[PDB]
């Protein structure tokens, strides 16, 4: 169980390639013994300059510390096969074993064959913010939340995935972190303006973009460059200014990066069609000032997610299988 690394990949049957990841191919597979489905992140190491990827080391470090329902967990690590009597000739590879998940959220929306109801969105966000609360409580930032990293199986279970670019957070005192994190569409305004000493608020912003995306069926802030991305946020959320966000003047790029004009916030107008309680949550989550922004705990305490009983909720009619593409 705990004796990782020494069990063999022979123990699984490779069904096929799922896709490419950060440090190798990813494979769907079935365990020969338990008959259970998994994903196998292959980690090559004959190639590569500094041996076993440090990015994989980070993901291993964090996932062994995170144990939660709605967080993708690493079951074990598994190896190729190592010949008769010369480990120096042996130049195989390792495989990180994860519970298999049927869909990612980007795939489901991009098809246009699925429609999420209020009850379906309630269930997804409840689960997402529970796993995110857990991670933040254990001083971890995800730093890469987006639709492609939110996995979903056919029995309604949501899992936050891909802690490759995750990081420890110091709450008792502030410290400097890497600025360029999160894919641009889900990146918060503080990072755009150049904040290095950032908080768990960055992850809540990304989850806010997703809440909106679940109603619009399309990313709400969709642009190619930092400047354009801030322009689009400002149009909907209002231009960043001291009246709303006092400490914004302290940020490196507040004067370099500026919107066309001082836009008014009109989120409640543009998302009038969304339910009222859902709109209250979205507003709090896409608040520009990170110190005023909703925490993951607070989202669970909101009206929209307060009384969502997950065992009582029925699973959504999802597509069975993809046609491999």
């Amino acid at each position: 169980e705990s004796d990782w690394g020494k069990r063999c990949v022979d123990k699984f049957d490779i069904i096929g390639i799922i896709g490419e990841g950060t440090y190798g191919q990813v494979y769907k597979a079935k365990d020969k013994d338990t008959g259970e489905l998994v994903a196998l992140k292959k980690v090559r190491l004959d190639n590569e300059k500094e041996g076993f990827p440090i990015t994989a080391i980070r993901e291993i470090k964090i996932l062994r510390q995170l144990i939660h329902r709605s967080v993708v967990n690493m079951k074990e690590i598994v190896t190729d096969k190592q010949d008769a009597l010369d480990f120096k000739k042996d130049k195989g590879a390792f495989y990180l074993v994860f519970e298999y998940m049927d869909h990612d959220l980007m795939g489901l929306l991009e098809s246009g064959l699925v429609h999420f109801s209020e009850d379906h969105i309630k269930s997804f966000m409840k689960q997402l913010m529970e796993g995110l609360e857990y991670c933040h409580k254990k001083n971890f930032l995800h730093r890469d939340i987006k639709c492609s990293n939110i996995l979903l199986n056919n029995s309604g279970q949501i899992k936050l995935a891909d802690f490759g670019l995750a990081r420890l957070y110091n709450s008792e005192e502030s410290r400097p972190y890497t600025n360029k994190v999160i894919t641009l569409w889900y990146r918060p305004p503080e990072l755009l303006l150049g904040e290095e000493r950032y908080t768990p608020a960055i992850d809540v912003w990304s989850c806010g973009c997703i809440l909106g995306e679940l109603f619009t069926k399309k990313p709400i802030f969709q642009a190619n460059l930092e400047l354009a991305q801030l322009e689009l946020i400002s149009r909907l959320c209002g231009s960043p200014c001291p009246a709303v966000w006092p400490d914004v003047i302290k940020l490196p790029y507040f004067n370099t990066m500026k919107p066309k004009k001082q836009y008014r916030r009109r989120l409640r107008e543009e998302f009038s069609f969304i339910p009222s309680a859902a709109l209250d949550l979205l507003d709090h989550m896409l608040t520009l000032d990170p110190s005023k922004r909703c925490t993951a705990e607070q989202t669970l305490q909101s009206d929209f997610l307060k009384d969502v009983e997950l065992s009582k909720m029925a699973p959504p009619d999802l597509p069975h299988w993809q046609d491999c593409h």
Partner: peptide, 12 residues
């Protein structure tokens, strides 16, 4: 390194 990792059971 391969053996080192196996030996420490990926408990980093």
């Amino acid at each position: 390194e391969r053996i080192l990792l196996q030996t420490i059971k990926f408990d980093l």
